[PDB]
Design a protein around this ligand. Structure first.
Ligand code: BYN
Ligand code: BYN
Ligand code: ICB
Ligand code: ICB
Ligand code: ICB
Ligand code: ICB
Ligand code: K
Ligand code: K
Ligand code: K
Ligand code: K
Ligand code: MN
Ligand code: MN
Lengths: 500, 500
């Protein structure tokens, strides 16, 4: 089964790429697995596969850390992401994002129901498992629980059956048969939860599948539109209908090759302690005391020799940055284009802790609009910051065609030299804010509102007659024939490989 | 003569450090020398010494490019700067800046007049030189002239004789015996020029010395206070009185070992075309048509086999960033401390194109002030943006004690996650602005006023009870004994030198 369609095959692919370290000696899920993984993420090292996890019993479980993190080399920097999607390991960010957007104007390919799959190789009922007895990791030393759920997909369906959402949202063990987790607006798990709470008749049927098809975990991390069933979007993107099996205790469907499946309910009435957690922006606030949603687990099914993927998230660079940030940027690019805004590219610079998105403007089209910075800033901000795809993003940086938004150095150069603080910016105080950013939830103002800005790093003539500068760099301030001579004589003169 | 006190010795020191490439084949001053130098600066390669410059006659001149640029290795990244100052090549930025500030509370050591020096080995009078006939570089293809002056020091003295200023300001060849250059407020060359213009009796006696003592070119690049003679500050910093010789045609004094000396006058009445020039922020605006100050050259003296240093400035990283940015930051640190502000460190992040300064706060002292963000931001901005040392800086970022301001990644992390746009900032529109920044001089607003901001990246409890987070990183989210175990077993498990 191909790597992008089967997590077990994906692990093999990383091994074959020389992008995996198999640790076969005992490793403690209390901090040690996550510490190794954190070190991997901070240094762009190989993904760790913990085959011998202290507390693993009867097949539950091994851990794969850093499933979507960066490789050291520039040439295959995003190779782990490419392996989620059947792309060459040398794929660029543009190509990865374009793959993730490709299904947006294709007919969905709905999933195929099959009678069984590897996820049914083992089962534990309501009398046979205890979630406190599994080797669930403590990921950061001040975390408020053991975060079993950092890289599985929650499966919930609208009461009317018409929309089945797949998404990543964190969750930790509360007791032997419950989790608590984040379920917050405007996220689709929250939107669907609210539909069940308004109906008021029952708890939400739920499943959480770990080690799902890599192409599915990518879509689970992306803000595809309201009402769109991720399974059919992944089908269209991949050209293949995903094979799903029914849950044993409810009528939801899970990927046939899921490593581990939890089946149960997301309560419409109960809460319990959740967090704190070392989060995507790089912080934990020890002792924060929040209430979260509460999930009841009724059944576990799993593959022989099941593998749990884990994101040891925090400071750069991990799945929260590579997947949640980039995929939000991708959706923002499309949103802007669908609102007739002349945006070619979008990326959330890692340097911004994926709190900014840089928007590359087609300045030929901008000139034909005969508009101004103030007007255009407002239009862009209104589109993005009033939409769910803009939720996590607090600063939009508008740049002209010379800037490669996938290159953070160039975004920072343009921002720092082309956007006059105050005058070239528009603040947005009456939009939803992202409380996880420290300056929001732990800051001076409302946790849930405002704190957003459009920063215009377009220069004035980019609105009118065209770019009126050349860069003072090697590329732009010397003619072609001189540049090539300098390069050709570089090592001869006594100065100092692409793959590496 | 030691490297920090003699430019010729400094060149030898770079050779001995394996930090020099001697090019002995012909190189064109029309773009080629500068293109090589630009490539060096963009890649942190060895400094180029052009020993065979097309158009060099009768000893004028060789070129040293990239005299104050970065080395590739982390361990001796700032080694070329350290060689300006008798510091070990492994010196940190903090140590370099502390050396440059050390003379601020020492008695000056005035210079020593000697009867002759190497700068008198050759001379050309008013009938023997033509500045258009020298191998003056064209540094960027759209420059409005050949910029002879990118790394020499202008010498001007107050009418009353009490203050002799040394500073870098650019200048280009206007004709056989004149230069034009930037002379702009609030710079000390401008302040002194204004004193002569108010007296109204004569043009300003002037000299321009190239290849001066490295410790002197450092001070020439730093905004030491009004009225302070750089020569005596350099004397105090180095512990040695600098040896100066009198000019032949005026009563100014130049360093005895200067490579090349121009003697003449800076007009109090005349101007001529100046620029455009590929500038520190990374841009040139071809055809800009500005008038600049006009200098008349009456005499040239020079060393046998004279070497002209050259800065091929523009995009990262060159002397404008390493010296002008960092040295402004240093002065800002001191200014803040002298205004009883609890600042420990200051640095202009290269990522900001040295338009930001990050200010590290002693948050114990901040807490004892019992103040608020709004108040403290205003106080810091008022001190810095109303002073000459703040001229070139448009954004101040306040950070707490956990941030190393010499590490741009960490400044960017703190800015992006701890400063809420708008609410945690104060804009300053009624302060002098730096017109060279594109968003100022080529932007939407007044070229010379405003566009400044204090961005407070202190978190709320940093004002009150203390930091209330831990970072979600390897360093902070795992105990010491676990971290050391992970490091000790890193290569054993199968994961991947300080000098490299
Ligand atoms: C890739 C990735 C994404 C997310 C998360 C993580 C990873 C690895 C955690 C490590 C578990 C950390 C956690 O903070 N986390 C997370 C989360 N969204 C939430 O509502 N709640 C969460 O706790 N997203 C983001 C969401 O996955 C996306 O916003 C997605 O768009 C949602 O899907 P949908 O609502 O659009 O269907
Ligand atoms: C290191 C360095 C500094 C400067 C410059 C360069 C280098 C290499 C050029 C490559 C020549 C580019 C040019 O834009 N340039 C420059 C300049 N200051 C100006 O007024 N005008 C200039 O044209 N400074 C900055 C000044 O040297 C400092 O601001 C110093 O503080 C001034 O001395 P003072 O007025 O404080 O005595
Ligand atoms: O736990 C975290 O890092 C985190 C929570 C969250 C909520 C929404 C979007 C992205 C998210 N990331
Ligand atoms: O409701 C609030 O006051 C609040 C929510 C929240 C979520 C994450 C971090 C900090 C937060 N503060
Ligand atoms: O030419 C340039 O890069 C430049 C001009 C200038 C004026 C003042 C301060 C720094 C400066 N740099
Ligand atoms: O006076 C002005 O309009 C102006 C001055 C200046 C200096 C450098 C760059 C652009 C500029 N514009
Ligand atoms: K999703
Ligand atoms: K702008
Ligand atoms: K100076
Ligand atoms: K703040
Ligand atoms: Mn969805
Ligand atoms: Mn001065």
């Amino acid at each position: 089964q191909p790597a992008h369609l089967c997590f077990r095959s994906f692990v093999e692919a990383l091994k074959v790429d020389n992008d995996l370290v198999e640790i076969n000696t005992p490793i403690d899920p209390n901090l040690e697995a996550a510490a190794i993984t954190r070190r991997v993420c901070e240094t762009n090292d190989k993904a760790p596969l913990f085959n011998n996890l202290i507390g693993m019993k009867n097949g539950l479980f091994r851990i794969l850390g850093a499933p979507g993190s960066l490789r050291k080399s520039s040439a295959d920097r995003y190779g782990r992401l490419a392996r989620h999607l059947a792309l060459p390991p040398t794929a660029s960010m543009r190509e990865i994002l374009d793959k993730m957007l490709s299904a947006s104007d294709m007919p969905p390919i709905p999933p195929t129901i099959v009678p069984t799959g590897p996820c049914k190789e083992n089962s534990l009922d309501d009398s046979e498992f205890d979630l406190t007895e599994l080797p669930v990791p403590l990921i950061h030393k001040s975390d408020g629980g053991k975060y079993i759920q950092t890289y599985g997909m929650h499966i919930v369906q609208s009461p009317d059956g018409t929309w089945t959402n797949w998404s990543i949202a964190r969750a930790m063990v509360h007791d032997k048969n419950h989790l608590t987790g984040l379920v917050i607006p405007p996220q689709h798990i929250w939107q669907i939860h609210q539909m069940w709470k308004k109906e008021g008749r029952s708890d939400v049927p739920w499943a959480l599948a770990f080690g799902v098809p890599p192409a599915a975990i990518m879509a689970s991390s992306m803000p595809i539109p309201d009402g769109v069933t991720e399974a059919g979007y992944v089908g269209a993107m991949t050209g293949s209908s995903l094979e799903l099996v029914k849950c044993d205790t409810n009528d939801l469907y899970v990927p046939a090759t899921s490593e581990i499946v939890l089946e149960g309910t997301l309560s419409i009435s109960e809460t319990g302690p959740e967090g704190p957690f070392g989060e995507m922006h790089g912080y934990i606030f020890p002792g924060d005391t929040h209430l979260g949603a509460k999930y009841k687990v009724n059944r576990i099914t799993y593959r022989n020799n099941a593998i749990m993927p884990m994101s040891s998230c925090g400071r750069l660079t991990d799945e929260t940055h590579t997947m949640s940030g980039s995929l939000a940027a991708a959706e923002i690019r499309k949103l802007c284009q669908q609102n007739d805004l002349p945006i070619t590219d979008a990326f959330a610079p890692f340097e911004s802790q994926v709190t900014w998105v840089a928007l590359r403007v087609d300045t030929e089209k901008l000139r034909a609009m005969k508009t101004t910075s103030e007007g255009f800033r407002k239009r862009v901000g209104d589109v993005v910051f009033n939409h769910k795809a803009g939720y996590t993003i607090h600063r939009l940086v508008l740049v002209g065609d010379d800037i490669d938004v996938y290159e953070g150095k160039d975004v920072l150069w343009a921002f720092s030299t082309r956007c006059r603080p105050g005058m070239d910016e528009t603040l947005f105080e009456d939009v939803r804010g992202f409380p996880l950013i420290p300056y929001m939830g732990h800051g001076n103002g409302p946790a849930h509102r405002g704190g957003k800005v459009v920063s215009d790093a377009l220069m004035p003539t980019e609105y009118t007659t065209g770019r009126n500068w050349e860069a003072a760099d090697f590329n732009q301030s010397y003619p072609e024939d001189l540049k090539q001579k300098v390069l050709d004589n570089w090592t001869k003169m006594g100065f100092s490989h692409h793959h590496h």
